[PDB]
Amino acid sequence: SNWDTKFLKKGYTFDDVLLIPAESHVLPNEVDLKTKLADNLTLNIPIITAAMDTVTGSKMAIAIARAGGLGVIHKNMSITEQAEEVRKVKRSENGVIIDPFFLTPEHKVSEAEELMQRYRISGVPIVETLANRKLVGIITNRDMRFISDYNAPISEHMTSEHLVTAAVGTDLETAERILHEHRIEKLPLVDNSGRLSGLITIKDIEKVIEFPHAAKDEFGRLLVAAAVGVTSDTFERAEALFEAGADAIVIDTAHGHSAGVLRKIAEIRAHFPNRTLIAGNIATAEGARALYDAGVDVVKVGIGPGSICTTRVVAGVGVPQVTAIYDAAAVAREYGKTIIADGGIKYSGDIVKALAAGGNAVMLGSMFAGTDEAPGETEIYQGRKYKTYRGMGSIAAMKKNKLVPEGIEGRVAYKGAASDIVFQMLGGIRSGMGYVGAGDIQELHENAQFVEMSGAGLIESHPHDVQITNEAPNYS
Amino acid sequence: SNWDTKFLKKGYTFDDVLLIPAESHVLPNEVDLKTKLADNLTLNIPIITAAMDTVTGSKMAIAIARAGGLGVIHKNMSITEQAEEVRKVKRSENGVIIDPFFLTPEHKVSEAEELMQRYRISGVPIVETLANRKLVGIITNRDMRFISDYNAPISEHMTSEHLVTAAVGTDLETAERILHEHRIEKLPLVDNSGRLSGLITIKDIEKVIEFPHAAKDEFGRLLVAAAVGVTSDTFERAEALFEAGADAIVIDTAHGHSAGVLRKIAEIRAHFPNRTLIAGNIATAEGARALYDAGVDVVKVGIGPGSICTTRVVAGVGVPQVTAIYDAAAVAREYGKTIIADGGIKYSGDIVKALAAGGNAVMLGSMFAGTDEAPGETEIYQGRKYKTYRGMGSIAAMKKNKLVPEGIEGRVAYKGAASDIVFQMLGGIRSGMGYVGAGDIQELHENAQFVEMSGAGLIESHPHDVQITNEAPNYS
Amino acid sequence: SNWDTKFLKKGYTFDDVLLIPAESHVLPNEVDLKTKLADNLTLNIPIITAAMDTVTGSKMAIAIARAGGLGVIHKNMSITEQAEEVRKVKRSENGVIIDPFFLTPEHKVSEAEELMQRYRISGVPIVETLANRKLVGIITNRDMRFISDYNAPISEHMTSEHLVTAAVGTDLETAERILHEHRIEKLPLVDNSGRLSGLITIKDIEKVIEFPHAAKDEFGRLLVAAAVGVTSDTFERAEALFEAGADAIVIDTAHGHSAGVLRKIAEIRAHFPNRTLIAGNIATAEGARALYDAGVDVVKVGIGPGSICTTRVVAGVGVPQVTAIYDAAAVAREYGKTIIADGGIKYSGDIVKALAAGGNAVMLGSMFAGTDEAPGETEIYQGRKYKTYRGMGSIAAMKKNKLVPEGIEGRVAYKGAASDIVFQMLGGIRSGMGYVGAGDIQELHENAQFVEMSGAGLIESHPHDVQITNEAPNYS
Amino acid sequence: SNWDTKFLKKGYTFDDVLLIPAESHVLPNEVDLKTKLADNLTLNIPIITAAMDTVTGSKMAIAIARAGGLGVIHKNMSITEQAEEVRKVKRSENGVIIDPFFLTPEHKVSEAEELMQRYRISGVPIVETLANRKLVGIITNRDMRFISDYNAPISEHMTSEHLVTAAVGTDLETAERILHEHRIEKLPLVDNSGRLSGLITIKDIEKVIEFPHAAKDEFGRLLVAAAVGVTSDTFERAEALFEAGADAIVIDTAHGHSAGVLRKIAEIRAHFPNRTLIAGNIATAEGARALYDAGVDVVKVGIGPGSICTTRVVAGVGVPQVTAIYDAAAVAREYGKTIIADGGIKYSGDIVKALAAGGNAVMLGSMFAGTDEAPGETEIYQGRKYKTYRGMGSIAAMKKNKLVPEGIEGRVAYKGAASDIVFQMLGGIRSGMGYVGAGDIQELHENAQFVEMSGAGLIESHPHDVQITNEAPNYS
Numbered sequence A, B, C, D: 001s002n003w004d005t006k007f008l009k010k011g012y013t014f015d016d017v018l019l020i021p022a023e024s025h026v027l028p029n030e031v032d033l034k035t036k037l038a039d040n041l042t043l044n045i046p047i048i049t050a051a052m053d054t055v056t057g058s059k060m061a062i063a064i065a066r067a068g069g070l071g072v073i074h075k076n077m078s079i080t081e082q083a084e085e086v087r088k089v090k091r092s093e094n095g096v097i098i099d100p101f102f103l104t105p106e107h108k109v110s111e112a113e114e115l116m117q118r119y120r121i122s123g124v125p126i127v128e129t130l131a132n133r134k135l136v137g138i139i140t141n142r143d144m145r146f147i148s149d150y151n152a153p154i155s156e157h158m159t160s161e162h163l164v165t166a167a168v169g170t171d172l173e174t175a176e177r178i179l180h181e182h183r184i185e186k187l188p189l190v191d192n193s194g195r196l197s198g199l200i201t202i203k204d205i206e207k208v209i210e211f212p213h214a215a216k217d218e219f220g221r222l223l224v225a226a227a228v229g230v231t232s233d234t235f236e237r238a239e240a241l242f243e244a245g246a247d248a249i250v251i252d253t254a255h256g257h258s259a260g261v262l263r264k265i266a267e268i269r270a271h272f273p274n275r276t277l278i279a280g281n282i283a284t285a286e287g288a289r290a291l292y293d294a295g296v297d298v299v300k301v302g303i304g305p306g307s308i309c310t311t312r313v314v315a316g317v318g319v320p321q322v323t324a325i326y327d328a329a330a331v332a333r334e335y336g337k338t339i340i341a342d343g344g345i346k347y348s349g350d351i352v353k354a355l356a357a358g359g360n361a362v363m364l365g366s367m368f369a370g371t372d373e374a375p376g377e378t379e380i381y382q383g384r385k386y387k388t389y390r391g392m393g394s395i396a397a398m399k400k401n402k403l404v405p406e407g408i409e410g411r412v413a414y415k416g417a418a419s420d421i422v423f424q425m426l427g428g429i430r431s432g433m434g435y436v437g438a439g440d441i442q443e444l445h446e447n448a449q450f451v452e453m454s455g456a457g458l459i460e461s462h463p464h465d466v467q468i469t470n471e472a473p474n475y476s
């Protein structure tokens, strides 16, 4: 009976501690920000965007991946809508490197314009038979503008020129070379039998230049994760997401230490033995252990620290985030697995503390909530523009009247491009890691130490006794 | 001499702790909210409304009982007024299942309309003799509208039809059946000699449907408690209340660890050996022990935590509520008795903490203070409507000029129906208990543990860094 | 070297602790508020008014004494002015019970009106010779109105009636009897030789009725203390004050643990071996010991807690008041001497904590600062009236430009009569002592215990979550 | 692995502690404020002005030195500009006591007016040959006004009078005597061969009177320090500064516990074996040790406490200042070296705490930021005048767009002359040291102790419950 151990212990939150400076042999610009979450999941920056309908849609998942992070597409939409959202992220870069779009000569140019405008593409590979996939040509914009009547076989108006192709598996470096020698923009990839396997474009090559640290899969396509809950349509949902290309699924739950959740997760794992599973939230060592034991690959920590979260107020449950991460990370290392610090982070400095306490990555909602990419609804008050930001446990989100919320509905100032937000936080992360001499996150877990501060020390830590009219892009 | 133990120890209040999540095998919707306070007192929800003249009158006592709770009628009124207030609660449902109203043929229809409008009833059972109680008929509204001159014997204008009755003790299920077969709304209950014992109505049956979790007595009448102090008119008051139907009395005192209070309580118990006694406030283990030893059944904990309480400021006395509940609950279990956590609760989450620290029920004042049912006086400021809320130790309350107050006078925003307030708090209670895996309050005492948080952790616990224009019905 | 004990320990201030309720056998109205500070100094209430030029002049010293307390006349004025201020307090009640005013027949009625209007009196005892003091008569208002030309011997216009007198030493009870039988208002007291020793009046008898708990000396005259510093004019000042009637002097210093102060105090004691000495401020056990060892009777505790004090901010020195009182009171009991808790008290509850931590009395400045009696200057802002309140270490006070202040200049709202302020605080003191069961201050030191509270607990202790538009006379 | 010692310990900031009063045998006006930082560096007051482009230029370095302190000229300017800034401080008093300005008869009066107006001087010593330096005369204002055409040899218009001189090495006391007997204002110093070595003026003698406690070098010239970073132009910079007269250089770094910084410092020391080196910031015992071991003479402590500093927020790194000073001072004494408490000081009381925790001097930025001398830019808001104050890590400062700041840009109210600010802080320092009985800073380290206070105690420490409309020059 814990009646005699009713008051267990004290917990620390980001504002109770500071990282202590230490000898350092690594400059901020040379710290390694990569983090491997699972065999299949390694990110170039320890940053992940929350699965919230006001933060992560395909645009955000695309922007955070290009920056080297991971986006988790929210499940507050139909399985079909969420899967298509996921496909959009996979189709972004090297979109058709595999599983290309294509039509037959039989089809009508109209159908070609249908998919050229639906998936927004300059050309459509044309194969003899949808089943044979033997490349016979390709229809392009130039072709569509020359064409008068679209109600005709895409054949009559074609490109039966001397097809220039490359073997399956040619990389971007060699394709760029081939595209340059032939003054072309699209390079179809076919096997030794002329069967179409995919297509490489000049843009793909350019995007590699534009976003050098993008987190991508084996095919050079941006990584993406998607969330699902523990309901009757979970499998259906999970299989639709994986089939759309998801590199991992996130079983998002309010209480991950629930028998039911553990039951469903084991069933999900039993069905997807190879896939990467990230699971719901816990804030204790046993909760992390229960989830790992259930087959999860990555455990997300966080009960109540959310900016828009009212769990601690309405249910009276939770644990200060720095302590929760730490207690859970003790198990993550026992199992040689990973953890995501989820919530309560408001400053770049908080990210370094969350990582130093044992996190392998942090999930951010509030910090991205008002960007160009975030799906939130724009509002104007006092002339300034805002972006709605609501907890998934709020009334509006839990919608299709109030029905016992664990979160609130709010809004945050317009922040502009997410790439800028990310750039500001990485600088703080690199500086933080430079101060404690951590060349990589591993050293951070092993060497970084905290000094506890009081409310006054927190005051000293923030700028004080000075009137600020123009704030820093990394401080309020 | 405690001079060497002047600084005894540290105390915790609701905002210093959080309940730690734990493995759970019970969903929120299946947690058991019942709580037995005494052999005679079991509630369907661990909620009780404060004995304050701005919170609990008969309307509130009726609403909280229908929801499964208990209302404590305040004593800031004459003994006669408080007793009638109590009768109103007993007469609400199955109001005349026993001790029915009745008149004789002799009486004048006028007297019948007198009691039909005083107690608001559609019919008046008519007996041959007030002493014989032999049912001879019943006068109804239809009868009153047909009647021209009321200054006449209720006989001349009557209902000497074929009386349809049921034996004493027939339950609502069988009465409903009888009422339906005879297309009637009132079913008189008589003994084998035709003597009237009570009456069952169609509404009674309907109210059982409308409020399925109502806390009721052996007769299916809503439960109710009433408060009394320790003065010379206490006995007179207590006996008037019990005689009106009170299921328990609350000896409400500022300092329950007083020799005088203990003296009076023992005298009250010596006189009412069977009755359920709930007693004044204490905040220590010895105070609870002194009261239990004096014969009390349920001890209420709380010295100074009240929203409108100034005891800690003007007298400088008190103890942080979570510690007080806990220290007292240690004794409650030694004696195998119960405790009510009284005051300082502002959020549904606080209720779960109060219960987890050892409370068997919580008493709420502020949270109900501005509802439809609360007796407070309405005020308008800035266009919005408010409801006065004053401590019973304030000047105005202590009235029939300032006379050394231990509390203040205030007001709170209009909250609408109390049933809605209750519904919001139960949801939070069920979620809280779900997180720690407590299927019932007992498991809550035995298994739930607290983690201590600092001021910063409290900040993290509440929503932050987000502009809220539309709040949740369960958070501010 | 304390370099290894640089961080000595933690200190508590009034807002860190609460008194724990305990069994009680004494009602608030029967608690004993008396406190003996020294053989010569016993007060009826443990309250003393600060020696500040904006708080204690003769009017305040008179009002607090009538209530049973002690007033300390400030030294921010000439020795002559301070002594006369002191005489005014002694002349208030039984003003001429000894050392009466008197003139000879020789004098001119003009001189009689001079002193009748200077000291405001209805009559002037007239003696044959200033040196003989043989009562020959008495001139009264009635006499002055009958008199046309004042430039004449008070003899020509006289009262050589049958003198009614009483022997030296007759008390008020017997004098009242004599005054009543002779229908007179003034009763001269003479020795067996007709020599005038003093005079008793009807008012004196009435004032005993009006203020039953007044703190008075052996002659039934109100008690009074006066402050002096440690300078070259100290002796001159101290002897002028004692000669005016001071029952005690207060050697007020910023740092009482100074070699110089201890030197001067010992010299003051060596010169006044019988007198009651109260000395400067200390906040440690050794400081209290140094002062006691120097010959002081009562030590006042307090370095930095003052509402208008900036010592802790500008010098960075001080110790939380509850800890200081306690550390010093440990020595006070070793020496069997007393302590005054000086400063930082803002609520009546704070008084009980200060007494419970070891204080024998508390000195209040801020709480009396805006009363009728306080010498502060009235100011009007937003229509409301204020009363200036400045620390004696502020610039303005240290005046005859800024010259390195240890305190600030401020103002407080007009509070009305001090008797009302006192009445509100005693009620809280009696309630506080009732809760812990302390029948007298001694039991308070021996039995009362503190429970430590956090910032949150402090929040819980004060009224919260309620809009207050009309405050209590004992809370803000 | 510190993974098991992740939460190292608690840190204290100025607002967590208070100095405890102690027996004292020294009055404030007799405390010794001198502090020796190095063999070559002893200040008359433990105060140094921050190397910030909005706080310390030559004017400030001049004012703080005259007061007995040390000014550190910031490096946010070209090496040439910073060196000239430094020369200005050396030329202030006894400006030409050595290395005097001079011209030949050959030169044109025009060139004489060029340097008389560039360096603002009443006269120009004239020597036969720039290489011989044999004094032949001196041109003065009177001479320039008599002269019509400046395009002529300074010879034609001269002062070949009977030259009055003094031997090299004559002090101000004897020079004053010589200047007085000859009714002259400038006294050339020449060797036994008539070679000019320098010049003493009446003003120099007057400035000794005007600023009696000025911190000066062996030649009676004000002391001055200058900052440099760890870059490729450091040596060039350091040698330019020393050559301009710098008495010490400050290697200012964000993280002084960096391998690179330690490398550069050792190289700087290896090159300047005699010079006084003050180095970057650390907040740990090892960091101080690493720097001392690298050859630094004085270590400055402080990571994150700055008013305009955001290091703790954006990087999440730092340590409460009182703890940092103390941990570092433990090493300073092991090595018998010194420390400068850098940042987080807002009140004079904070200076005493910083010194008591082990500092030998404190560096102040914010407190001087809006003075006459501070280089900040003036701004007007609401009619009042402000002075910009920005962290050297802010965007604007890091300028020649945002580029990952560790500090912010702000402004502070106009404060008037710095001499007044200094005067207010010394008074508080002397009072603070008087309370703990510290006759000098050494006793402060050895005897002073701290008592820890809570948030409430901090409240008690500051003025409270009083409306202040006119603040003290030493408190807000």
Ligand SMILES: O=c1[nH]cnc2c1ncn2[C@@H]1O[C@H](COP(=O)(O)O)[C@@H](O)[C@H]1O
Pocket: A050, A051, A052, A304, A305, A306, A307, A308, A309, A310, A311, A342, A343, A344, A345, A363, A364, A365, A366, A367, A390, A391, A392, A393, A394, A406, A407, A408
């Ligand atoms: O209504 C809610 N209640 C509790 N947690 C929520 C709610 N909505 C989102 N969250 C979680 O809390 C985190 C808050 O992130 P933040 O806004 O950056 O602090 C998200 O990643 C979600 O896991």
Ligand SMILES: O=c1[nH]cnc2c1ncn2[C@@H]1O[C@H](COP(=O)(O)O)[C@@H](O)[C@H]1O
Pocket: B050, B051, B052, B304, B305, B306, B307, B308, B309, B310, B311, B342, B343, B344, B345, B363, B364, B365, B366, B367, B390, B391, B392, B393, B394, B406, B407, B408
């Ligand atoms: O004037 C008063 N002083 C102290 N306690 C009071 C006073 N008036 C009511 N109370 C008590 O404090 C509780 C406050 O409940 P709350 O407003 O919900 O926090 C009530 O149940 C009463 O027991």
Ligand SMILES: O=c1[nH]cnc2c1ncn2[C@@H]1O[C@H](COP(=O)(O)O)[C@@H](O)[C@H]1O
Pocket: C050, C051, C052, C304, C305, C306, C307, C308, C309, C310, C311, C342, C343, C344, C345, C363, C364, C365, C366, C367, C390, C391, C392, C393, C394, C406, C407, C408
């Ligand atoms: O300028 C000042 N500095 C420090 N203490 C002061 C000053 N002026 C008065 N005091 C002291 O502090 C106490 C403050 O009382 P309060 O205003 O009731 O808190 C007075 O009794 C004096 O002993």
Ligand SMILES: O=c1[nH]cnc2c1ncn2[C@@H]1O[C@H](COP(=O)(O)O)[C@@H](O)[C@H]1O
Pocket: D050, D051, D052, D304, D305, D306, D307, D308, D309, D310, D311, D342, D343, D344, D345, D363, D364, D365, D366, D367, D390, D391, D392, D393, D394, D406, D407, D408
């Ligand atoms: O942008 C910045 N980040 C961190 N420290 C800074 C920055 N600018 C100046 N400082 C340092 O912090 C101190 C702050 O002094 P203060 O304003 O008096 O608290 C200065 O002496 C510098 O060492």
